[PDB]
Symmetry: none
Subunit: 201 residues, 3 copies
């Protein structure tokens, strides 16, 4: 369970191919580093489980199945690459952010960029499998490389985003260009709503 509000980023240091997937070592500076062997982390919007930590979390390793490699943008991660981090949410009477599973529903490539109001707002357009189009509502939410964002408009086969760079500098969004590929988690809320309707007949 996550809010899709990225705490910080980390640098991929190391990658071991193995007979059942890829083995990532990552470095970062957490606020109040609490990492425990086992606890969950949304790496670019993708929940991964901690198999080791090397400095009460300052470094930590996780392991991605061949499947998580085909499901997500993880296939393309290179040593050194900056990555979005969010630990599972804590109990708090102040609930903020969105409802984020950290379960990638497929991927999307950047089609267009634009800088309206002279670099106050960045206008991305992103390709989506049309099976997802149903879950992607204008003025609705979505979680892109683990960054919770509001869809501005959606078409079949694409949708539009706008960002304040008060997100772009504090995340991996800095290095979004060309088509450089994004993990998409559609709004769970939508999935649940849809299910309540189906079950009425």
């Amino acid at each position: 369970m996550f809010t899709g509000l990225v705490e910080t980023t980390g640098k991929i240091l190391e990658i071991q191919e193995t007979n059942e997937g890829r083995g990532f070592l990552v470095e970062t500076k957490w606020v109040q580093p609490d990492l425990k062997l086992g606890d969950s982390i949304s790496v670019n919007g993708c929940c991964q489980t901690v198999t080791e930590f090397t400095n009460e979390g300052s470094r930590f390793r996780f392991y991605a199945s061949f499947k998580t490699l085909e499901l997500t943008n993880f296939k393309f991660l290179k040593v050194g690459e900056e990555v979005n981090l969010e630990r599972s949410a804590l109990p708090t009477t102040r609930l903020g952010g969105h409802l984020v599973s950290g379960h990638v529903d497929g991927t999307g490539k950047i089609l267009s960029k634009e800088e309206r109001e002279g670099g106050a707002v960045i206008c991305y357009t992103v390709q989506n499998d049309p099976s997802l189009s149903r879950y992607i509502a204008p003025r609705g939410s979505i979680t892109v490389d683990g960054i919770s964002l509001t869809v501005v408009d959606s078409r079949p086969k694409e949708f539009d985003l706008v960002l304040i760079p008060e997100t772009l500098k504090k995340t991996n969004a800095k290095s979004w260009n060309s088509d450089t590929i994004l993990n998409l988690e559609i709004d769970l809320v939508a999935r649940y709503l849809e299910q309540l309707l189906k079950s009425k007949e």
Copy 2:
């Protein structure tokens, strides 16, 4: 209040039957054992209250009402069963599962088992009361014997699961077979959403 993230398991040592229902003695190794008389614990997804503890919880007793016997799989617990444990969350508890009440909604029988990728994923199908079908969204969450899980697909009156072996070995799931009954808690989120719609129309 729980996150459906199993801390450890414990061995049922002993079973009484009394004016306060059948009486379970359990042994386990907690990290930082904090057990107080009256604290809550989700025993295979079922909140139970501590009536006694030794060595601050290394062993502890609780009592299940004849009602919680009718509500849950507790009738089928045998001495020496390993069972799934989770203490109520702390303010410093990563909510690595989702929102879990520890209030069993219903039970479910395993219909099918299957070992894809040579036994690297176990593929369960599980029967549910159709009252619940509407709360069980594909790619949505659910709490099975207190284990927070993502539903893979759902039908009216059944749903599909897949387990990474790390989950199977770390929980009671290893011993899930045809004759197993499972405690089912549907996502609170769904129940709340449903209520906002009923009253918003």
Copy 3:
């Protein structure tokens, strides 16, 4: 925060009218008092701050605004009334109820009591402003006079509760009858979910 798990109760000893509201003196013996000038406390589900303490904690005073008098059942408190107490959580407090702000949303009148299965379950029905109906989901949570409880069934007018006598003896619920006024804190979760929905409209 709080978890809507009542530690103990106290007896109102004294009530001073003041230029600001009513001034309550309360007594109790609770385990390991670290009660400090300033700490927060949910008095029948209502966060109040301690302005004084006597005899190493045994007694403590707090002050309720005319607003908290109109908002809550505090208007009805008489000298010698038993009151539900819960200290704000520490990092080592187990959250045995749910997520509780201690910020009263409304009050509710008891309509019906009933003692089914020979007095082993008490069946309360409670009137709520229909403003709240949408937050009150069957099999959902709620905080009634600071007691965390699961709603059994809910209508737009009313909702149903069921209680163990163990709860009634250990809280102020003993003194719930037809026409008792109760402090209602609806589940935050619902309020937050409602916000995710409204943003998609």
